[PDB]
Structures are given as C-alpha cells and as structure tokens.
Design a protein around this ligand. Structure first.
Ligand SMILES: COc1ccc2c(c1)O[C@@H](O)C(=O)N2O
Ligand SMILES: COc1ccc2c(c1)O[C@@H](O)C(=O)N2O
Lengths: 489, 489
C-alpha cells in the first residue's frame, strides 16, 4: 500500500470522528459481581461450553469492569475522538425489569466510565443493547422471542429509560441496537449464539425452535423495541445536540456472475441483510422482497408501529467487515429454505466464478478484505436510503490465536495485516466522502482483544493487545501505533 | 413535428424492414365458408353480442378472405417490404385436430396469399396463432385452459407442423404466438375476450373461472406450445435463412414517483407484462418476481421443458402502443390480488403524480402516446435480454368511430394524429438503433380498419380505410400516403 496512498487525518474534515469500539459482554468480565444479574450469554457459556470453539466464557473477558481506566487511557494516547461501548442490560437491571430494581453498581460503573471519557475529551457513543439479554427475561418469556410482542418491548424501553435517565445529560450519541441481523440469525437461525436455538434436525444446543420463524419474531421485537425507545427518547431526552440510531451488521454483495439473475440475487441479499432492519426504520416496513419471500413468517406492523419506525434515527451505524458474491437460486419445488437467510434465494459465495476469493483472506474463517464493498454499501445508503449521517461503527479483523497454533505476543503486536486492512478501509471512506457520502466517522472494531462469542478467545480483534496471562495487561499493537500517529500528527 | 424531425428511409439500413400487419379473425370474414371451423371468437361474438361494444362480430371483417389480392396491391403500392398476417387455426383444422382433418380450402388461401405477396416482392411474416382457437378444442378440453398441459400443446404443435409443411418452402419468418399476455389476461382474467371467463363476482360472460389462476394456466400452455413448435421447426424445417419467434404485447413502465419503491414496482410491472412470456423463452423459466408473488398459482416447468424453452427463438416481436406509470403497492393484510395482473403489486397509472397523462391521449380509451417507453423497452431488450433481433410487430392507434359519434370518412382519411404518432415511433427506432438496439423492422399495426375484439367496429386502426358500406372498399389514409412516400423515395 503506497506511502502516498496511506490515509492522513487531513484527508477528512476536522469534525470527522475517529474512535474504537467494544461490547459489554466481550470485555467487562465481573460477570456476577456488584449485583449484576445473569445474562443469556452467561447462561449459554456456562451451560454449553461445548458450543464455544475453545470452551471459554467471558467471566473475565478483558476485565474492563475493573480496568476501564486503562481502556480510556489507550483511547487518549491514540488520540481517539470518541469511544463506542455498550451497556450490559443485566448489570443495570439484574432481573431486567422495573420491579426487578436498578442496580446502583451498574449505574456507577457506566457513570464513571462516561465521565472519565469526557474528562479526556473522548466522546462516548453508547450502545444500549449488544446481545446481552438478562437471563431473567429469557426464562420469563424467551426474551426477544416474546410471542406477545409486548413484554420484551416494554422491558427494553424501560431499560432504555434507565440509561437515558442516568446518562442522558452526558451522552450525546445513542445506539439502541448493534448487529440486529447477526443476533437474530445466529441466536435463532443457526443457533451458534445464546440461547442456541434452531430448527429440529439442525446442529445447535436446542434444536427445537424454528430457524425459519424465530429469527423474524426476534427481529420484529427488536424493531418494535427500537421504535418505542426512540419515541421515548425524542419526547423527553433529545436535545438539538444529541442523536440516536442503531448500527447494522452488513456484508457487501456483488453479483456472482454477469447474468441479470445474479444482479437480482444481489439485490435480494442486500435486502435480507441490510434492508431487514434498515428499511423498517426508514420507511416503516420490511423490504418488499422479504415480505414476498418470508411471507407469513415475517410479522406485519400495526399502522401506528410504522409511523414510529419511519425516520426513527438521526444517524446510522454500519458494521462492515467483508463482502460476498450473491448467486441466484430459482424458486422451485426442488428448493426449500431451511434458515431465515435462505429466504433470499441466493447463495453467498467467498469465491467468484474464477475460483478466486472476492478478496484476500484476513485470518479467521470469514473475513475477506474487500473495501470496495464498503464503497458500494455507502453508495446504496447515499442514493437509495436518503444519504443519512453514517458512522462505520465496526471494522477490523481477527488474528487467530488457538491452543494448537498460539499467536506469539511478538506476532500479535506486529499486526500489519490489520493495519493494512484498516488503512485501506479508511481510504475508502475518503473516496466515498468525495463522492457525496454522508459518512461522519469510523470506529476500529475492538479496542481490546476480547471474548469473541462462539469463537471464544481463539481470535484477537483488538488494536490493543490483552495479555490475560498477566492480569490482562494491555499493550498497543502496530495498528494502534499507526492510529495514534494518524490522530496526533 | 419538425420537417427535420420527420423520418426518412435513409435513416435506417437498406436491409431494415418496413411493413403493416393484421390478424386472421379481424380481417378475414368468411367465418364459416370453405369448410372453416368455428372459433372461440365466432362462438363468443355470436353467443354474447352484449359483450361486444357495438354488438358486432367478424363474420365479414374487412372481407380479406375474398379480397386478399387487393390487400397485397395496397401493400405493394405503399412500398412495404413485408406484411405480417396470422393464420386462422379453425380455417386449416376445422376440428382443431389432426383426426379432424386439414381443410384444403384453408390451405389454398394462405398459399395464394403468400405466393402473391412474394410475386410482388413483399416478405411474409406469418403469425401462426392470434387468439383464434378452434371452438372444437375449447369444448373438448377448454383449449388453452387444458389442465393437463398436453392436449393443447400437442394439437397446437400439429397445427404448426401443418403450417410448416404447406408454407415452409415460402415462409422465412414465423411467429408462433402474438400478444400472449393480452390473450391470457383478457380471456381469463378480466374476461373481456372470448370465451369470457373470470372469477365469480367479476363482470364477464362466464364468472365461474379463476382470474388468479386460469390466465397462468393458459399462459403456461402457450409457452409449452411455443416450445414444442420451435423444437419441431428447428428439427425439420429451419434453414440458414429462416427464423421463428413470437411477439409480445407490452406497455412501457415508468416509476410513478421518485421513491425506490416505485422503481421496484416498475420492475415488477415489466416482469408481469413482458417478462411473463419473454423470460421463459430466454432462460427457461418465469421471472423470479412472478414466482415469488404468484406462487403455486403459476405452474412449474419440467427441467426438460425449460430446456426447449430457453433459446426458443431467432428473433422477437414487440407490440408497443403505450406506457404507464407503475405505482407501488405493499404486501399487506389490506390488499388481495383479484386479477392475475394484480400479482405485480403495483397499480398502473395513466396520470403521473402531477395529474397529467404519461403522454397525449390518442383517442381510444387506452392508447397514450409515449415513444419514450418504446426506447426504454428496447434498452431493456438490449442490455438485459441479450439484444436479440427485434421487430416492432405492432404499432398504431385506433380512431373512434361509433354510431353515436361517427367518424366522417374525410376525417377518417385525414388521420394526422395517426401519422404524427407513427413517425414519432419510427424516429424512436432510429435513436434506439444508434444506441445499439438490435431492431430490424417496424410493422404499422392494422393494414386495414377491422374488427377490434370487444371494441368491435367502434375503432379504426388501419392505415388503409375500409368502407363496409361499399363492399369493404379500401382507401389509403394520409398515414398510408406518407408510408408510401417514405418507402418509395
Ligand atoms: C467467530 O465469531 C463470529 C463468527 C461469524 C460472524 C461474526 C462473529 O460476526 C458477524 O458480524 C458476522 O458477520 N459473522 O460472519
Ligand atoms: C378492444 O381492443 C383492445 C383493447 C385493449 C387492449 C387490446 C385490444 O390489446 C392490447 O393492445 C392491450 O394491451 N389492451 O389494452
């Protein structure tokens, strides 16, 4: 990557935002201290260690509940403009409900972190929910599987309230949800995420759900929850200087072949991945393609739910990592969807028709570098969805570090493959910005190496190394080095 | 229209084709002479004159069965390179079947017509089927409603063999079907065409069919029929110099508003109108949108049928008259398709959001001049469907002439509105051609004023006037005058 091709901070406006992000369950630890209630993930890891690649859990994680001061320190040192982190629902509301009571320690922790960030001039981008549903709600009504579409909605809205109430004065950027598609699809479709539900006959801890129905039920409840929280937010906490939205996980889609069929398959793929949650918050309802394909398996919104959903955001987060080639699949008696994602009638290929991958492999089993994909996504957001304020809330790669193939600390700190990847994506935002894209910021995903869900600790996504052998000592990597130089020059 | 804007023959290639077209039942007459069998239309008009605007029938038509030598004279005098006419199924096979026997008189008629056109240097474009189904087959197995997708396709394939066997040596251009969409939709959807079937509750002669199913059944049979005939043709009659295809009726589609929703609606509209029959003969199956929306109501093809379907043409006909704005309709509990054409989930508007029509009205209830839509249609044919050899097999307008507001022969002859319209579309073909369009010809629709189905004789579409008050005497209109000048310079 040419020396002049390498991004410079002056390439972006002075009001542009650069930061890093994390998620509560992945870094906090102290899973059962100071009154924090049990979460779906606490439950899943403890009860199904066999469902985690290396059978680990996040009881400690990056131990950020105790070491948050150092996290804010690395942020300051790197010269980061902002920090995106999430709030653990069960740590704020142990039972997840109002009557359950608010846990003062949870409030204290987040209150302290936020103040520390401000103190050092780092803007806090708070994600209210990042997959950590209080187990209490999970057993009471299955959480977001809530068939009534009322319970999980009200409890989330209240949770949202407790956050707005205790942090509204200090937090100017809110994100109700993060990666809603990954959450519903992996937790109820493939079953790789807590609680591990999937259609009978599939390989997951609880093969007694419905991969073709539950993800949509969960998704429906997430959208209702989001709408309700934004409604509450806009009415009592919103200030001219504050904003609220949600972040979507999305893989770019490129027509497998030159047939117009694959172009249609590609469109169905954007719809089922990004459109699923984006269109509802934009126009108030699911993509036409999804409704025509999922059918009754995709709930309908009430007229009053659509009004609330439509325009329920001031900004949008995009978590981009890789792209895929979408290959057409014809509707036929020979084909029956099994997973919610099959409803798109398109296979997502890593390799194009020439046998070469859409982009160079970044290390783990799924990330393939293709910054052009981010460009296409931003063009869609710009030309099709109103060109709203966009923040790349996640972007990065995971360095594999297994028991069988340990990543030497030396090799872990020399993360040049990560640096190249980051510099390239940042350059893409520059190209997109010149093209009229409304991108306002970029958050390197994973400030710290941490628990990676079903992958456990087999992957290091941080720009900051965490030596869990030595009390989780943090060491900046080369990528973090460059970011510092980038922000401080 | 500017004089610099008037098309000149030298605008197009020397090999480009210019002609006029007609349909058997509309001009022929002699409905029951020389052993000609009864057709679905003979039957419909006779049994339900209330379903014809002026309660007429085409027993005589323009009397072209007895006056064909004149039609040819008219054609040569205008300088037409070709003439497209259809062959009456019942006139060749009175029982519509092989067992029924071939009617020698029917054969001799088209033998004389073909040879005469050829002796006079006019190329014949033979349309095998134009809605005239032998009433015998209709009563036998419902004709194209044939629920077993065998009888009808077999009988139709025999009919085509007969045509190839007796005219093959002289005909170099065949068209299996003409306007398949209009036939299935109007005969079984809205039921305004013979036999007049529609869903219970709908206003037609026999409200005991199924508007959401029969059109698709008939259409399925037409595609199968078309596939076998081309297979038969390719195997025993095709020559290096001959070609076979079919002509599609199609209205241009333009987004109603600027929403990406209407763009999607527009796409679903091209699909249900053009794609319905075009995609199957291009790739071997119906468009995805239709299968996802029509579902089980739209029959599936056997893998072997898809084989014969894909690539079953050497050229394609396009019958264009007007366009419509496609306005989005969401899938929802507040909507239920009633007609097959409603599966498109889009309302087709004449007036855009501003209240103005898509194009200036041409007189009858449906034609609105919009040459742009022809350009769009050709761009689609070029870029999406392989830019195959295209012939505009129909293009024109119908002048209103009812016994309430009769059209003075003089005014009927001074058809400047028709001329302006014709010149505009011919000009459009020039623009499209330079843009890469593979258009090879243009046929002005309606060589003669004739029977206009449910509109009966209330509309004069011919470029040549037929005075049925004087033994159907033919008189050239100004439009025919110009076409002569155009072809002869
Ligand atoms: C190993 O942990 C993950 C495995 C797969 C995924 C993951 C995390 O995060 C999602 O955003 C994602 O798109 N998939 O591909
Ligand atoms: C009665 O004459 C007709 C009236 C309407 C139609 C027709 C013929 O055939 C096609 O051109 C068509 O698309 N419709 O609109």
């Amino acid at each position: 990557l040419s020396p002049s091709e390498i991004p410079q901070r002056d390439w972006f406006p002075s009001d542009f935002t650069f930061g890093a992000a994390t998620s509560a369950y992945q870094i906090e630890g102290a899973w059962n201290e100071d009154g924090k209630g049990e979460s779906n993930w606490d439950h899943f890891c403890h009860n199904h260690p066999e469902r985690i690649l290396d059978g680990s859990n996040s009881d400690i994680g990056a131990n950020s509940y105790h070491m948050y001061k150092t996290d804010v320190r690395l942020l300051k040192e790197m010269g980061m403009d902002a920090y995106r982190f999430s709030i653990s629902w069960p740590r704020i509301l142990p039972k997840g409900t109002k009557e359950g009571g608010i846990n003062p320690d949870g409030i204290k922790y987040y209150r302290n972190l936020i103040n520390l960030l401000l103190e050092n001039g780092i803007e806090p981008y708070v994600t209210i929910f990042h997959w950590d549903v209080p187990q209490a709600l999970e057993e009471k009504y299955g959480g977001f599987l809530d068939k009534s579409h009322k319970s999980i909605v009200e409890d989330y809205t209240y949770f949202a309230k407790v956050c707005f109430d205790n942090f509204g004065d200090k937090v100017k950027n809110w994100l109700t949800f993060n990666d809603p598609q990954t959450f519903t699809s992996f937790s109820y479709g493939t079953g790789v995420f807590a609680p591990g539900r999937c259609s009978p006959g599939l390989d997951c801890a609880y093969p007694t759900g419905n991969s073709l129905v539950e993800p949509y039920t969960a998704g429906h409840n997430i959208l209702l929850a989001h709408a309700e929280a934004v409604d509450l937010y806009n009415k009592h906490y919103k200030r001219d200087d504050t904003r609220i939205g949600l972040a979507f996980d999305v893989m770019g889609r490129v027509p497998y072949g030159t047939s117009f069929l694959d172009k249609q398959a590609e469109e169905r793929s954007w719809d089922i991945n990004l459109g699923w949650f984006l269109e509802p918050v934009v126009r108030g309802d699911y993509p036409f393609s999804m409704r025509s394909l999922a059918r009754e398996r995709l709930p309908f919104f009430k007229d009053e739910q659509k009004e609330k959903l439509a325009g329920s955001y001031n900004m949008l987060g995009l978590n981009y990592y890789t792209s895929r080639f979408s290959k057409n699949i014809d509707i036929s008696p020979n084909y029956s969807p099994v997973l919610n994602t099959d409803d798109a009638y398109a296979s997502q290929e890593v390799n194009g028709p020439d046998g070469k991958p859409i982009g160079p492999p970044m290390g783990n089993p799924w990330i393939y570098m293709y910054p052009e994909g981010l460009k296409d996504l931003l063009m869609i957001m710009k030309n099709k969805y109103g060109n709203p304020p966009i923040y790349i809330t996640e972007n990065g790669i995971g360095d594999v570090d297994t028991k069988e193939t340990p990543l030497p600390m030396e090799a872990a700190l020399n993360d040049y493959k990560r640096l190249d990847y980051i510099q390239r994506h940042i350059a893409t935002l520059k190209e997109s910005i010149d093209l009229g894209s409304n991108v306002q910021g970029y958050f390197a995903w994973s400030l710290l190496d941490n628990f990676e869900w079903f992958a456990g600790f087999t992957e290091r996504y941080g720009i900051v190394y965490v030596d869990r052998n030595n009390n989780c000592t943090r060491y900046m990597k080369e990528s973090a080095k460059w970011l510092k130089e980038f922000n401080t020059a």
